[PDB]
């Protein structure tokens, strides 16, 4: 097998390319493989808001591996040890929740990088990340193939957006509209013109800074709008929601 | 908790009532609970064509238990020991594949009944089926609450349909259109007029014999047609197919 | 299904009713279901002193769901991300260990509330807590249906007991005799007059603040005593201890 | 490690010693370890009436391995492949259900022995049975350390008892009184006034033919009786029953 | 994704290429993936002599899927329902143990084929075999991409070897030295001149019929010999044996 | 069962005996048992750089329990709650990563001791640590049987080595050469020509302060050297590395 790491999601992001994603929220490797057969550009394995253990995450990576869709892992939080776990299992693209400050953003980057630059503990070289040694010179190759995406989803984070965007090692900034809406004084209502204005300017600011801009839009109209605004890693649904809706729609054909 | 067993699916079947179902093919308790929130009348936990162990089946029963949707279990085959396993875990409604003869149908019934009448081994009385003893006089109550559905899905089985329909202990006969189509000399094409004619007469014969008639129709048009013909336990989709289709439909909105 | 949240444990607690409970310590969904058939008022699913993963917790919730006994979840610690995980899986009643200050208690409340009331990140809409959107207006209903119980189980905690009892959003204070005893310099001797004294006074003070008073007593004598002292959410047993004792007692009939 | 096979259960059986046992019915490795700390002489890991997979059986063997209590495995049925599976995982004592004829008993014996004497499939050096080759000359050692117990628990099996007792390789004959009573036309109450005699005579006949005699008696009164009669491998409880009873008993102190 | 079935193992086999393989005996997806990074031509996932459930088999397939090594699945026995399960999860190459007669061999082929060609029940359309409908015209493509290997590993099997080699649908015949040796009256002594002789003649006869000839040799000397004799699907190791030996060899450097 | 705690690893450490170890990196109970049959002195169950959940850790302890090899658990980090979890499951020897200061070392020691001396949460009588109460006076016995090893593997930790060595309750100090080399500015090649001296001096300093000295050396040449220097708990391989190498070596015989 190949001795070079590659991260196709990162490669595409660097080329400015638009990547269409789906949230995977069931924790199950069975459904992750099924979802991978759809051909989304990326799949967000949600270790934050679905009850995934580190083993569930591992199994979902193994499930999607031979398919074209690229996995992105969101851990429970961007702490040193939880980041350590997901990087060692060979998650090359991370989405980190609740990044509110440039200092938090620098600490997240430090957690992903080995000494000199960061604080990542050594051990991937004999784990899935270096494919048990088949990846030669893993410590030398790794930074170029790691892709780091941070969520800006509070009023504090928007206030700090420029500082965060200037942090070395951050590849993209993701806006989660429902948390942001809540924090801005409009809980349960991202549809308010103030919120929409903030979302649009924030996306444009992220792209203007040369970084990738991300979004989750479960309403296709909102997804089209964020794409128009320049978001270029956009998740367009949550698998469990698509599932439940499909189930309801089929059943409705037979019930009065 | 209650000392009486009840099988609402059987109660409704006895009353002639139409019951709308969905196949569950992921093996996962996580998705089974999600599907149960839809409100289908029944959910077919497929131990035949999805890789369910006896524990997967157990977990899916525990998942759906507090919801209104009634579970129906299909084992890998209707052998004595596999039937034994699923009855002891408290699956009160079974769908048995590949029942081709009245003798096979009698043997299936014998597998579900304790001595005098049948060959079921004792032990449920301390298992999930009798809720570890909370169900009093389980051996006396049980037959009235067990619901047995058999699949007629070959040319041999159709030839034997009258004999099968006269077998004591059989509550319903299910027609699987794709196996039947194959066996009738039309593989991959249930849409042939010969096959449709056989399906319609078979449904009408089953109802004319006072038994419930079942069908799986993944095309809603076919489901409506089988309902019109008198099928009264009709599965109208496979959850994994509904899932994949929903995923494809969402993605298509963003890809040219 | 039902679109409304309810919390029977919390309604009873608010009425000042005595609720008799049991610790579940095996991690197993299989034993959780068996225990639920006893009809204890509540079952404490122990994620602190038994090796439960978030998945084990989930499966135990699924197991007890159809039965009348109400689940309570104790996480390994009361941190923001661990509280997030248990809320999202739909645990409506939490027992939080080692709450030592009014500040820690406020932080715990904040971890359970969405903006503006706290720090809880959204995502329960696409998870078990909101039954995948079947619970309508979850964000609006949720605070009413969440029951928070905090453990006062150190010397520091006792010093701050009045300050803790004044924290809005705390429904009950639970005295942990094993940790408290040790904290006081009487490890493994909770029966000491000095400890029994402090337990009694602590219980009366909790109730005097209009909050529920909780306790675990593995000795029935002690359980009746703490009930006489005013404790109204009282766990009276640990299931693994009851198992071991029952097995020993049966064996001893044939070894003597 | 130790290169010798030993079977303390079989050695004590051969000495005619009385061995006191407990059914393990939860399928869980967690409860199997807890139960092993009681020091029963044997623990019956029930793969017939509890929903154990071969993996669950493996994990319960691993759990109990360091304790004094000797494991006995009952598979779902005594087929060649299912006996092959449980022998390969290092189950050295088997309890086989539904052995109704001498021809069946011979076929079970052959399934436990390698060719050319029997039909056990050869591959134990790549499994736990030979501790991955740490047991030297496993194929030489294995017959002497394997203990075969069959269940005679039907009318037909009773009619065939003498003949079954003449089959070489059977170490013990187990009578299940609830199965036999059902088979004799007494569904539940277990051993009725009518079949006590039929049971006693059998126990005495079994011991008379130089074989061990087995029984499960969940009533201590009945267990004393069967021992008085000559039964020397007697299971005296079912762990899930002992659990439920103990939970009920502790709770009744507070609903009193 | 790709809508076409292919079987690289089968294409190579048809070309008469030598394919070097490894037994996987741990049941673990974790070790299966590690093994796949070695680049053996094939990996034998052993459901006969290791305690694999259908789920363990599934997870091992998912693990090795992205790597070049091609999986082969051996079920616990070659029965119709066990073959059904492994085909449906998408195992394209099967190794069937203990095929003793031309009749058994025909039955195995029939178990792998849909009507009119055999008895296989439909349902792979909604399973991993057809990648949930992403493989278009599965029913039409499938026979071409299925590779059947049968074990000739008893005296009965040898007597019927020519009849077995004449069965249409068999791609390869595998000689099992452990079972064959025992069947011949030389258990645990496959090295006996009489056995080595019969292995050699058997290999030449297999190849003479235009079928592939298979073998497992845990001794490299024997492996080279069987290759020299004409065997072209040759497993050369059992992964758990290689693990144990490697661990012993490292330890021995510090114990001597 | 035996009511006394013992820690053979700690007893031998105290005697200054040399103990030879192996890293267990696969997370699987199946491989842990196989590895235990080699008779290494100790086996490091790696919960920091392999994706172990607390349940995986539990199952590997259960697997190795009856063998002579002594288990050592490394948790993801040495936080209070994670040390609480692993102590409660009966891990009596801990290896704690990233111990950089004396204050950290004191905080780790306190996390291992009950109040009022430390801050370990009290609940071991409802867990495996006290074998569910079969270990009498566990709280009395526990300090003497717990063995605490800390990792000093960074520039800061090195600067602080004397002070760390002065902390009471630390039984051994482990040096990880790849982490330290990275921290000192040598990413990979592990221990470079430049840091051998820094390593040797540390090993001698550790033993000089009356503590045990630890090392992982995957190169046998380096392992002999560190032993020559005074290291007395030395891991000499990583099981997944030994596996991969052995697989490669066997395969190379046929790609030759
Ligand atoms: Mg968010
Ligand atoms: Mg069918
Ligand atoms: Mg406590
Ligand atoms: Mg029986
Ligand atoms: Mg063989
Ligand atoms: Mg390190």
Q: Do D48 and B121 touch (CB under 8 A)?
A: yes
How far is ligand 3, taken at its centre, from the CA of residue C219, in Å? 16
The alpha carbon torsion through F174, F176, F179, F185 (nearest 10 deg) reads 100
A89 contacts on F by Cβ (under 8 Å): 51
For E152-203, give the DSSP string: E-SHHHHHTHHHHHTSTT--EEEE-HHHHHHHTT-TT-TTSHHHHHHHHHHH
For residue C128, the chain A residue with the least C-alpha distance is A50
Q: Do D25 and B54 touch (CB under 8 A)?
A: no
CA-closest candidate to residue B106, choices B115, B97, B118, B116: B118
Q: At D246, which helix (H) or strand (E)?
A: helix D239-252
> Quick count: other Cβ atoms within 10 Å of Cβ C194?
12
B80-88 vs B102-112: helix crossing angle, rounded to 10: 40
Chains contacting D (3+ CB pairs below 8 angstroms): B, C, E, F
Give the list of residues 6+ apart from residue E256 with CB closer than 8 angstroms, or none.
none
SS3 B115: coil
CA dist F25 to A53, E24, F60, F237, Å? 17, 18, 11, 10
Contact call for C and F: 3+ CB–CB distances under 8 Å? yes
Nearest by CB to A241, from C116, C133, C137: name it: C133
Contact between D16 and D22 under an 8 Å Cβ cutoff? The reply is no
Question: Dihedral of CA B155/B160/B165/B168: which sign?
Answer: negative
Calpha distance A50→A38 (Å, rounded): 21
Q: Do E38 and F248 touch (CB under 8 A)?
A: yes
The structure tokens listed for C66 are 């159809």
For A39-75, give the DSSP string: --SEEEEETTTS---HHHHHHHHHHHTTSSSEEEEE-
Q: Do A26 and B28 touch (CB under 8 A)?
A: yes
How far is ligand 6, taken at its centre, from the CA of residue B69, in Å? 52
Q: Do D53 and B54 touch (CB under 8 A)?
A: yes
Calpha distance C82→C89 (Å, rounded): 11
CA dist C19 to A42, C33, C47, C235, Å? 49, 19, 21, 8
How far is ligand 4, taken at its centre, from the CA of residue D184, in Å? 13
Residues of the binding site of B: 151, 153, 178-179
Q: Do B128 and C33 touch (CB under 8 A)?
A: yes
The strand pairing partners of D148, in sequence order, are D94
> Quick count: other Cβ atoms within 10 Å of Cβ E136?
12
Calpha distance A226→F102 (Å, rounded): 51
For residue D65, the chain F residue with the least C-alpha distance is F66
Nearest by CB to F243, from E39, E220, E246: name it: E246
Question: Dihedral of CA F152/F157/F162/F163: which sign?
Answer: negative
Q: Which residue has the tokens 């009318």?
A: D155
Contact between B63 and B254 under an 8 Å Cβ cutoff? The reply is no
Q: Is E49 a catalytic residue?
A: yes
How far is ligand 6, taken at its centre, from the CA of residue F153, in Å? 6
Q: Which residue has the tokens 């923001």?
A: C80
Residue B60 — φ and ψ, nearest 5°? -70, -35
Interface test with E, best of F23, F243, F244, F256 (most E CBs within 10 A): F243
Q: Do B244 and A38 touch (CB under 8 A)?
A: yes
D141 is in an annotated binding site: no
Check B49, B134, B192, B197 and give the catalytic one: B49
CA distance E129 to chain A (A): 12
How far is ligand 2, taken at its centre, from the CA of residue B98, in Å? 7
Residue E158 — φ and ψ, nearest 5°? -60, -45
Check C4, C16, C17, C49 and give the catalytic one: C49
Calpha distance D177→D184 (Å, rounded): 10
Nearest by CB to B133, from D48, D185, D241: name it: D241
CA A44 vs. chain centroid, Å, equals 6
The structure tokens listed for D226 are 């069967």
Residues of the binding site of C for Mg(2+): 153, 179
Calpha distance C227→F214 (Å, rounded): 53
Pinpoint the alpha helices (H) of B25-79. Answer: 29-36, 54-64
A253 contacts on B by Cβ (under 8 Å): 220, 223-224, 236
Cis ω on the peptide bond leading into residue D116 (within 30° of 0)?
yes
How far is ligand 2, taken at its centre, from the CA of residue B119, in Å? 26
CA F183 vs. chain centroid, Å, equals 20
For residue B121, the chain D residue with the least C-alpha distance is D179
Contact call for F and E: 3+ CB–CB distances under 8 Å? yes
Residues of the binding site of F for substrate: 151, 178-179
Residue F22 — φ and ψ, nearest 5°? -140, 135
CA-closest candidate to residue F107, choices F79, F87, F128: F79
Contact between E65 and A65 under an 8 Å Cβ cutoff? The reply is yes
For residue E216, the chain D residue with the least C-alpha distance is D123
Resolution (A): 1.9
Give the list of residues 6+ apart from residue A149 with CB closer than 8 angstroms, or none.
A72, A93, A94, A95, A96, A171, A172, A173, A174, A212, A214, A233
Q: Which residue has the tokens 């649009």?
A: A200
How far is ligand 4, taken at its centre, from the CA of residue D176, in Å? 5
B51 contacts on E by Cβ (under 8 Å): 54-55, 57-58, 85, 88-89
Q: Kindly identify the ligand whose nearest atom is closest to the C-alpha of F175.
A: 6
Q: At B180, which helix (H) or strand (E)?
A: helix B177-183
Q: Which residue has the tokens 């566990």?
A: F138
Q: Do B241 and E55 touch (CB under 8 A)?
A: no
D40 contacts on C by Cβ (under 8 Å): 247, 251
Technique employed here was: X-ray
Residues of the binding site of B for substrate: 151, 178-179
Calpha distance E227→F254 (Å, rounded): 10
Size of interface D-E (CB pairs under 8 A): 71
C124 contacts on A by Cβ (under 8 Å): 49
The total number of residues shown for chain D amounts to: 256
Q: Do B67 and C1 touch (CB under 8 A)?
A: yes
Fold of C1-256: TIM Barrel (3.20.20)
Q: Which residue has the tokens 């982490």?
A: F179
Calpha distance D213→D227 (Å, rounded): 9
Contact between D55 and D27 under an 8 Å Cβ cutoff? The reply is no
SS3 F248: helix
The total number of residues shown for chain F amounts to: 256
Contact call for F and B: 3+ CB–CB distances under 8 Å? no
How far is ligand 5, taken at its centre, from the CA of residue B79, in Å? 26
Q: Do E182 and D53 touch (CB under 8 A)?
A: no
Residues of the binding site of A: 151, 153, 178-179
F184 contacts on A by Cβ (under 8 Å): 115
Q: How many CA atoms lie within 13 A of E1 on its CB side?
A: 24
Q: Do C88 and A51 touch (CB under 8 A)?
A: yes
CA C97 vs. chain centroid, Å, equals 9
Nearest by CB to D51, from B54, B80, B115: name it: B54
Q: At E226, which helix (H) or strand (E)?
A: helix E220-228
CA-closest candidate to residue D143, choices D92, D104, D97: D92
Nearest by CB to D50, from B53, B81, B127: name it: B127
Check D30, D37, D49, D139 and give the catalytic one: D49
């Amino acid at each position: 097998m190949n001795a070079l790491l590659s991260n196709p999601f990162k490669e595409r992001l660097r080329k400015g390319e638009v990547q269409i994603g789906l949230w995977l929220s069931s924790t199950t490797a069975y459904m992750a493989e099924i979802a991978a057969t759809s051909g989304y550009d990326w799949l967000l394995i949600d270790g934050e808001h679905a009850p995934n253990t580190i083993q569930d995450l591992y199994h979902q990576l193994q499930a999607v591996a031979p398919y074209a869709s690229q996995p992105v892992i969101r851990p429970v939080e961007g702490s040193k040890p939880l980041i350590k776990q997901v990087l060692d299992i060979g998650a090359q693209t991370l989405l980190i929740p609740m990044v509110d400050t440039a200092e938090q953003a620098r600490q997240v980057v430090s957690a992903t990088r080995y000494p000199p630059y960061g604080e990542r503990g050594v051990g991937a070289s004999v784990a899935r990340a270096a494919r048990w040694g088949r990846i030669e010179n893993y410590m030398a190759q790794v930074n170029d193939s790691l892709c780091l995406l941070v969520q800006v989803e509070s009023k504090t984070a928007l206030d700090n957006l420029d500082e965060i965007l200037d942090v070395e090692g951050i590849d993209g900034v993701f806006i989660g509209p429902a948390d942001l809406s809540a924090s801005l004084g409009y809980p349960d209502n991202a549809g308010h013109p103030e919120v929409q204005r903030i979302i649009e300017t924030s996306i444009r600011r992220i792209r203007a800074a040369g970084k990738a801009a991300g979004f989750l839009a479960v309403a296709p109209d909102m997804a089209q709008q964020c794409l128009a605004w320049g978001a270029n890693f956009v998740a367009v649904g949550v698998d469990t929601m698509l599932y439940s809706d499909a189930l309801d729609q089929r059943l409705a054909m037979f019930k009065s």
